[PDB]
Amino acid sequence: RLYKALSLLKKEFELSKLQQRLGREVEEKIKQTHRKYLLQEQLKIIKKELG
Amino acid sequence: RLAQPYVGVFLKRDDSNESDVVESLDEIYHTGTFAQIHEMQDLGDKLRMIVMGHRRVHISRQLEMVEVENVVHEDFQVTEEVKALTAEIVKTIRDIIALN
């Protein structure tokens, strides 16, 4: 049972890694949107605060 | 007078314009969300209707109206590891309502 629990910890941990890694890659692919767009957002928020 | 009164719900495109809403039918998105009406009230104004996102639909051409429940929802047969991401999604959602 301790070995089966280890193999389940392997499968579950490797699964958490594939989920975290796919999410990390996917976060980087959101980060591929340029910082100019972020500063432009802040420019839009500066105009959003123009009321 | 209809036994099943209804209203559709669509999403507006950029540059909202009431005159275009009555002039042209392309301003409304092909996506529409048909739903049944609940009840009118009109406490102060004569038009305070309630709307819902119930039956999604994407009319192929609203100008032409034909419709179909093309509620695509493909999912992999193994629904074990697909929900692991859900814990992070709800954790994000929880952080938005918590921090904001």
Side-chain angles (χ1 to χ4, degrees):
Chain A
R1 51 181 54 193
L2 288 174
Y3 179 88
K4 182 174 272 192
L6 191 68
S7 301
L8 274 182
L9 269 173
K10 291 180 200 177
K11 194 173 185 181
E12 296 292 334
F13 170 68
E14 291 298 329
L15 173 65
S16 65
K17 297 289 95 176
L18 170 57
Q19 290 303 330
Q20 186 182 9
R21 285 190 302 93
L22 170 61
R24 171 59 168 80
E25 197 195 2
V26 167
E27 288 145 18
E28 170 166 1
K29 294 178 179 198
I30 306 155
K31 187 189 281 190
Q32 295 291 91
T33 307
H34 296 286
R35 273 70 172 175
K36 62 95 179 175
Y37 161 61
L38 292 157
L39 303 175
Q40 271 198 342
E41 287 169 283
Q42 295 301 296
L43 188 154
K44 293 168 183 188
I45 281 134
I46 281 168
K47 286 184 175 178
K48 208 183 151 172
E49 287 316 309
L50 194 70
Chain B
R1 278 70 173 174
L2 306 171
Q4 299 296 349
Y6 59 94
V7 65
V9 180
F10 310 84
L11 194 51
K12 68 176 175 312
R13 78 171 190 96
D14 291 328
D15 176 15
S16 180
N17 274 327
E18 301 184 5
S19 56
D20 297 355
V21 170
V22 298
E23 276 174 6
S24 301
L25 310 177
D26 298 334
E27 309 274 346
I28 313 307
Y29 281 122
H30 296 271
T31 57
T33 306
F34 303 156
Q36 302 179 2
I37 297 170
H38 302 51
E39 181 54 19
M40 323 316 174
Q41 179 67 255
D42 301 340
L43 292 185
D45 306 329
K46 294 180 178 181
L47 178 65
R48 183 179 176 168
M49 65 181 289
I50 310 181
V51 294
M52 295 323 302
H54 186 66
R55 285 187 306 191
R56 60 180 57 184
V57 64
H58 175 262
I59 311 298
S60 305
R61 203 58 204 85
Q62 59 187 352
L63 200 168
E64 293 179 354
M65 51 186 107
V66 63
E67 78 295 356
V68 62
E69 295 298 340
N70 70 312
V71 183
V72 180
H73 191 61
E74 299 294 348
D75 286 316
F76 304 90
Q77 190 52 13
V78 175
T79 58
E80 166 60 4
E81 314 177 339
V82 304
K83 68 180 179 304
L85 180 58
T86 304
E88 185 174 358
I89 293 298
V90 299
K91 269 185 197 180
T92 302
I93 290 163
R94 183 180 296 184
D95 295 1
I96 299 300
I97 64 173
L99 307 181
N100 188 265

